Amino acid sequence: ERAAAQSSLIQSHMQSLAANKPSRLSDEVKSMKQELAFIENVIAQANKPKLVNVIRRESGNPDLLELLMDLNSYTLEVTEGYLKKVNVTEVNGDNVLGPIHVITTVVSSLVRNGLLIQSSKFISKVLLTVESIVMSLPKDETMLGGIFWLSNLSRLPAFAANQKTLYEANGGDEKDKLTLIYLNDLENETLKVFDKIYSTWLVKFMKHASAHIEIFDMVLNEKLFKNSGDEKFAKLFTFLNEFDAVLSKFQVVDSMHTKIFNDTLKYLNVMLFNDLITKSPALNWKYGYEVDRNIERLVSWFEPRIEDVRPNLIQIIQAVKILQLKISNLNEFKLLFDFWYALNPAQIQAILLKYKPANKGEAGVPNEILNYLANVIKRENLSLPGKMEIMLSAQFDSAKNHLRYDTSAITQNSNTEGLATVSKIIKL
Partner 1 sequence: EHMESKLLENLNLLKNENENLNSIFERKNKKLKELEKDYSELSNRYNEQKEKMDQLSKLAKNSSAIEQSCSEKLQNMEVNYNSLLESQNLYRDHYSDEISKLNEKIGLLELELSNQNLN
Supply the angle between the helices 146-154 and 177-213 in degrees, to the nearest 10.
Answer: 150
The region of 120-128, 154-162, 172-180, 333-341 touching partner 1 under the rule CB under 8 A is: 333-341
Nearer to partner 1, 36 or 245 (CB): 36
The rounded Cα 375 to chain-centroid distance in angstroms is: 35
Nearest to 266 by CA among 312, 311, 229: 312
Assess 332 for contact with partner 1 (CB under 8 A). yes
Residue pair 381/387 in contact (Cβ under 8 Å)? The answer is yes
- Separation of alpha carbons 374 and 384, rounded Å: 16
Q: How far is the CB of 298 from partner 1 (least distance, A)?
A: 17
The torsion defined by the Cα of 170, 175, 180 and 181, in degrees rounded to 10, comes to 150
Q: How far is the CB of 318 from partner 1 (least distance, A)?
A: 7
Q: How far is the CB of 262 from partner 1 (least distance, A)?
A: 17
Helix H or strand E segment including 256: helix 254-274
Binder of partner 1 out of 2, 3, 15, 169 (CB under 8 A): 15
Binder of partner 1 out of 211, 245, 335, 358 (CB under 8 A): 335
Binder of partner 1 out of 108, 129, 324, 416 (CB under 8 A): 324
Nearer to partner 1, 336 or 391 (CB): 336
Residue pair 78/31 in contact (Cβ under 8 Å)? The answer is no
Site residue total, partner 1 (CB under 8 A): 38
- Separation of alpha carbons 55 and 189, rounded Å: 25
Instruction: Tell me whether residue 286 is exposed, middle or buried, using C-beta atoms within 10 angstroms of its C-beta: 0 to 12, 13 to 18, 19 or more.
Output: middle
The region of 168-176, 210-218, 313-321, 392-400 touching partner 1 under the rule CB under 8 A is: 313-321
Assess 230 for contact with partner 1 (CB under 8 A). no
Assess 124 for contact with partner 1 (CB under 8 A). no
Per-residue mark of binding to partner 1, 265-304 (x: CB under 8 A): --------------------xx-xx---------------
Q: How far is the CB of 312 from partner 1 (least distance, A)?
A: 13
Assess 372 for contact with partner 1 (CB under 8 A). no
Assess 140 for contact with partner 1 (CB under 8 A). no
Assess 341 for contact with partner 1 (CB under 8 A). yes
- Separation of alpha carbons 51 and 307, rounded Å: 44
Give the number of other CB atoms < 10 A from CB of residue 30: 11
- Separation of alpha carbons 376 and 352, rounded Å: 14
Instruction: Tell me whether residue 337 is exposed, middle or buried, using C-beta atoms within 10 angstroms of its C-beta: 0 to 12, 13 to 18, 19 or more.
Output: middle
Q: How far is the CB of 22 from partner 1 (least distance, A)?
A: 10
Number of H helices, E strands in the chain: 19, 0
Per-residue mark of binding to partner 1, 21-60 (x: CB under 8 A): ----x--xx--xx-xx--xx-xx-----------------
Residue pair 409/163 in contact (Cβ under 8 Å)? The answer is no
- Separation of alpha carbons 66 and 197, rounded Å: 34
Q: Tell me, what amino acid is at 354?
A: K
Binder of partner 1 out of 112, 175, 326, 402 (CB under 8 A): 326
Q: How far is the CB of 355 from partner 1 (least distance, A)?
A: 14
Assess 7 for contact with partner 1 (CB under 8 A). yes
Q: How far is the CB of 12 from partner 1 (least distance, A)?
A: 5
Binder of partner 1 out of 192, 207, 208, 321 (CB under 8 A): 321
Nearer to partner 1, 314 or 390 (CB): 314
- Separation of alpha carbons 376 and 394, rounded Å: 25
Give the number of other CB atoms < 10 A from CB of residue 357: 17
Q: How far is the CB of 402 from partner 1 (least distance, A)?
A: 20
Assess 397 for contact with partner 1 (CB under 8 A). no
- Residues of this chain that bind partner 1 (CB under 8 A): 7-8, 11-12, 14-15, 18-19, 25, 28-29, 32-33, 35-36, 39-40, 42-43, 285-286, 288-289, 314, 318, 321-322, 324-326, 332, 335-336, 338-341, 363
